[PDB]
Amino acid sequence: SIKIRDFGLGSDLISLTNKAGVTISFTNLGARIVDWQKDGKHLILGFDSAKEYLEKDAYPGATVGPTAGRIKDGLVKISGKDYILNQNEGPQTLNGGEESIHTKLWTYEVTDLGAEVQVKFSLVSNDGTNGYPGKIEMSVTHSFDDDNKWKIHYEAISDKDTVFNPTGHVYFNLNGDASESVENHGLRLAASRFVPLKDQTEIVRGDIVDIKNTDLDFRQEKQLSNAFNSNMEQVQLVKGIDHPFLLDQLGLDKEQARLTLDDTSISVFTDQPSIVIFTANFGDLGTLYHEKKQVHHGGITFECQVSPGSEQIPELGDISLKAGEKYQATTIYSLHTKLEHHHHHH
């Protein structure tokens, strides 16, 4: 079933229930996921209205871009030309600049395919918006099906050569309570290397480092507490995880990551080369989610994209987008129950 209602400020809430009874909801404010529940329990973090997003934190569950992450000094080179983008984090351009796409009302249309329901959000980034050459016609399609798969399909075409590398900023918290840390969740991640940050400004260091057999090695499932309790420099620097992980094997067919808690697992598939993981290292900020003060480590993201830093480390990729060339990216989050035995205590 599909249901729609006003969500505040002119945005709407689109809520779907599949045949298994799982419900998921989105809003056109930032083409974002608001909630995902199973048996009355929240699997992700979200607010109860639009204003909350605008007043507390506008990134959760949103579509962010045109470029996700930080671009050092907001400088990119596009077809031999240097362009300076909007700098909203010191000299850095973070998640596309200020008042970016995650803050806009996108138009949308819903398509019911029976076993699958699609929500296609559209927006146009005018040429020159926040310094990005355009115009860029973008669309984000979120779909949910009877197999409990939530898929995000991105498409974009630009009138001018530009850069494009958006991602989805959902936060998972299988505890269903923001006040409960994710340290008790199990993580499996198919990545042997990571990208270290230079310092507190969080720009990339310049190197790629192998993490095998360190507390950041999750090729084999381990509790998140291992990472959180680590005194590895990188962990101390950010007070948790806030890094890009390079996937070892590319392809939409491979389970790149799996997040488990008791009998629930979330699997991650994507066609992108990296996964930026940030564990809500907010300290005592205590943002209120459903009236629960969020704890430090009270959430975890899986931002699938080309790794941030390619400006400095060319080996990570190329996010340029040529005029008229069609961009596409697909990321899928699927839910399962009893995929494995996960019985621990913290």
Ligand X SMILES: OC[C@H]1O[C@H](O)[C@H](O)[C@@H](O)[C@H]1O
Q: Which residues bind Na ion (CB under 5 A)?
A: 10, 12
Q: Which one, of 259, 222, 249, 261, lies nearest residue 334 by Cα?
A: 259
Distances (CA, A) of 289 to 46, 129, 195, 322: 7, 32, 31, 41
Instruction: Write out the H or E segment, with its range, that includes residue 237.
Output: helix 233-238
Work out how close the CB of 96 gets to Na ion at its nearest, in angstroms, rounded to a whole number: 24
Tell me how many residues contact a copy of itself (CB under 8 A).
30
CA dihedral 100, 101, 103, 108 (to 10 degrees): 170
Work out how close the CB of 166 gets to ligand X at its nearest, in angstroms, rounded to a whole number: 13
300/187 Cα distance (integer angstroms) = 11
Per partner kind, with CB cut-offs from 5 to 8 A, the member of Na ion, ligand X, a copy of itself, none near residue 56 is: none
Residues 258-317 that bind a copy of itself (CB under 8 A): none
Token pair for 335 = 């839910």
Q: For residues 157 and 285, which CB has a smaller minimum distance to ligand X in the complex?
A: 285
Handedness of CA 317, 29, 72, 45 (dihedral sign): negative
Residue of closest CB approach to Na ion: 12
Burial 270-301 (b: 16+ CB within 10 A, else e): bebebbbbbbbbbeeeebebbebebbbbbbbb
Q: For residues 10 and 324, which CB has a smaller minimum distance to Na ion in the complex?
A: 10
Residues 189-248 that bind ligand X (CB under 6 A): 202, 242
Binding mask 135-174 toward a copy of itself (x if CB under 8 A, else -) reads x---------------------------------------
175/169 Cα distance (integer angstroms) = 18
Per partner kind, with CB cut-offs from 5 to 8 A, the member of Na ion, a copy of itself, ligand X, none near residue 98 is: a copy of itself
Q: For residues 105 and 285, which CB has a smaller minimum distance to a copy of itself in the complex?
A: 105
Binding mask 98-137 toward a copy of itself (x if CB under 8 A, else -) reads xxx--xxxxxxx--------------x-xxxxxxx--x--
Q: For residues 118 and 312, which CB has a smaller minimum distance to ligand X in the complex?
A: 312
Contacts of 345 (CB under 8 A, 6+ apart): none
Work out how close the CB of 238 gets to Na ion at its nearest, in angstroms, rounded to a whole number: 38
* Residue 59 lies near ligand X (rule: CB under 6 A): yes
* Residue 289 lies near ligand X (rule: CB under 6 A): no
In the list 301, 305, 307, 310, the residue contacting ligand X (rule: CB under 6 A) is 301
Token pair for 55 = 């007043």
Token pair for 296 = 């430090």
160/153 Cα distance (integer angstroms) = 22
* Residue 172 lies near ligand X (rule: CB under 6 A): no
Q: Are 41 and 176 in contact (CB under 8 A)?
A: yes
Token pair for 115 = 């076993």
Residues 93-152 that bind ligand X (CB under 6 A): 94
Residues 23-62 that bind a copy of itself (CB under 8 A): 28-29, 50
CA dihedral 299, 122, 7, 331 (to 10 degrees): -20
Tell me how many residues contact ligand X (CB under 6 A).
8
319/305 Cα distance (integer angstroms) = 10
CB atoms within 10 A of CB 266: 25
Which residues bind to ligand X, rule: CB under 6 A? 59, 69, 94, 202, 242, 276, 278, 301
Which residues bind to a copy of itself, rule: CB under 8 A? 4, 6, 9-12, 28-29, 50, 86, 97-100, 103-109, 124, 126-132, 135
